[model samples]
Target: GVDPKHVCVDTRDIPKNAGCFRDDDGTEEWRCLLGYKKGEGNTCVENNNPTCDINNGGCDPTASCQNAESTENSKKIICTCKEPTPNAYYEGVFCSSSS
Candidate 1:
């Protein structure tokens, strides 16, 4: 009697319901996976959801959006302005005031 052996995978990086291994032919194959785990990992998704780009920034319309981790799930706004320009300089809380 012979038993049809099953295959196995040992990927700690891959998360549940993301993907599985395919080693029927012996050469194990792993594919790109994304889920809740970590990033910059052997296999993981980069959660780059920095609230600023995801929605309208809180910064003034005249200022640029400088994203900073306001909280674990959201990013705060750092109102930025252009440096000294040929025409004028834009600084302060709102870049709207040009000099």
Candidate 2:
């Protein structure tokens, strides 16, 4: 979806089910979707606890918030590549390494 290049989000303190992406420049970005908030240190979290940005990101033509998922009764959402896409999907506060 959308080349998966321009589509990205912050990795620090990323949410529980947020999508992850890595670029050639070694930039790691997450899919900041609804129910999540951007916090200090470029972090992201769930349940509207606190955040710096509300609308964290916009999706590509193929990708969308419709792909967001979370545990039942959860108050957070994370981005993900549409079905039939690669299995590069991820969910966590941060990737193995930082940018």
For each of the candidates, give the backbone clash count: 0, 1
Report the alpha-carbon TM-score of model 2 versus the true structure.
Answer: 0.36
Model 1 root-mean-square deviation: 20.9
lDDT of each: 0.34, 0.40
lDDT of 1 by residue, 1-99 (tens): 111122336465454323444333444433322211233434433343433442223333444666665443213445454442111111112222333
Query: What local lDDT does model 1 show for residue 80?
Result: 52
Runs of candidate 2 exceeding 4 Å displacement: 1-20, 24-26, 30-34, 48-61, 67-80, 91-99
Cα TM-score per model = 0.27, 0.36
Spell out the clash pairs found in candidate 1: none
- What's the lDDT for candidate 2? 0.40
**Candidate 1 runs further than 4 Å off:** 1-50, 53-56, 71-75, 84-93
How would you encode candidate 2's per-residue C-alpha lDDT over 1-99 as one tens digit per residue? 222233355455555535666643557766543455445545545544322233322333323333233452122433344544333224322222111
Please give the lDDT score at residue 82 for candidate 1: 43
